[PDB]
């Protein structure tokens, strides 16, 4: 009859690349599980991302600042890719404060105990003025999917402050998923296959936790079909 696939060794190709394997899976179930998990991962994972950036120097997205090789436009574009995970608070306000010439990177942000920057060498900007200071108040919060910064503006009829810049928030920890089903040989019965899922994620989610959350979402969705109300 049935034998449940069991999680086996989760190796780390890199801090962003992980392969999770399910060895004891019956024939005909490999592609089903792989497709379902891939869709859930690219669809329903929670993640931390930036929404509001409050740069002291500039007033709007299209105004440049002194001593930077990058427009505030690219400041927001690079802050979009900020790989960050939060644990206790669903919403946090990171503070970046740096003066002097040099490439201002992600590690330069004042990191709290509830916030971990999994990408420290991520370049934010380049401060080319010997005595200018860059001060950012970056709002990073939890979410799912992709919310363009054009929906919360309708919820309050334009942001009351002017210094806050809205960034389209992509709460997608995973950006690449593939699954391969291979003919496994095991003492368990004679007909089982192994499913290997290779994952490129921003490193802000544990691969085991990602798979567990995906399976939880799949089960909660299948709950309705398991028990038909009518």
């Amino acid at each position: 009859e049935f034998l449940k696939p069991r999680l086996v060794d989760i190796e780390q190709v890199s801090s962003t690349h992980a392969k999770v394997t399910l060895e004891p899976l019956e024939r005909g179930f490999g592609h089903t599980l792989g497709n379902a998990l891939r869709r859930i991962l690219l669809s329903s994972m929670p993640g931390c991302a930036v929404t509001e950036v409050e740069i002291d120097g500039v007033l709007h997205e299209y105004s440049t600042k002194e001593g930077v090789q990058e427009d505030i436009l690219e400041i927001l574009l690079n802050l979009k890719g900020l790989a960050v995970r939060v644990q206790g608070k669903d919403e946090v306000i990171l503070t970046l404060n740096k003066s002097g010439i040099g490439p201002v990177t992600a590690a330069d942000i004042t990191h709290d105990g509830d916030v971990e920057i999994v990408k420290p060498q991520h370049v934010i900007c380049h401060l080319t003025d010997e005595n200018a200071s860059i001060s950012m108040r970056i709002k990073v919060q939890r979410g799912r999917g992709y919310v363009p910064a054009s929906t919360r503006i309708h919820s309050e009829e334009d942001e009351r402050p002017i210094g806050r810049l809205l960034v389209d928030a992509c709460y997608s920890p995973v950006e690449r998923i593939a699954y391969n089903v291979e003919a496994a040989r095991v003492e368990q019965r004679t007909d089982l296959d192994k499913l290997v899922i290779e994952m490129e994620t921003n490193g802000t989610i544990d691969p085991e936790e990602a798979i567990r959350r995906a399976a939880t979402i799949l089960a909660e969705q299948l709950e309705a079909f398991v028990d038909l109300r009518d």
């Binding site: 891939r38 690219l42 669809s43 709007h60 690449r176 593939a178 699954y179």
Partner: protein
């Protein structure tokens, strides 16, 4: 006329189903719809198109 005040307004227009998006060769098109990334096809490595 005494004064002339010109105001510049910046709109961040994002691509969406319907915009005329075309290639170099005369290849044309209208954006059909923005299907989720998972719905897009993927190769062996898993890279979506």
């Amino acid at each position: 006329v005494l004064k002339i005040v010109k105001v510049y307004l910046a709109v961040k227009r994002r691509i969406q189903p319907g915009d005329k998006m075309a290639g170099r060769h005369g290849n044309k098109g209208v954006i059909s719809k923005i299907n989720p990334i998972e719905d897009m096809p993927y190769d062996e490595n898993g890279t979506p198109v």
